[PDB]
C-alpha cells in the first residue's frame, strides 16, 4: 500500500 513511496506515504 501507500505509505511506501514517499509520494503517497504520507496518508496512505
Same mark, same amino acid.
Given at each position: 500500500? !501507500? %505509505?511506501?513511496?514517499?509520494? %503517497?506515504?504520507w496518508? !496512505?
Amino acid at each position: 500500500g !501507500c %505509505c511506501s513511496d514517499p509520494l %503517497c506515504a504520507w496518508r !496512505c
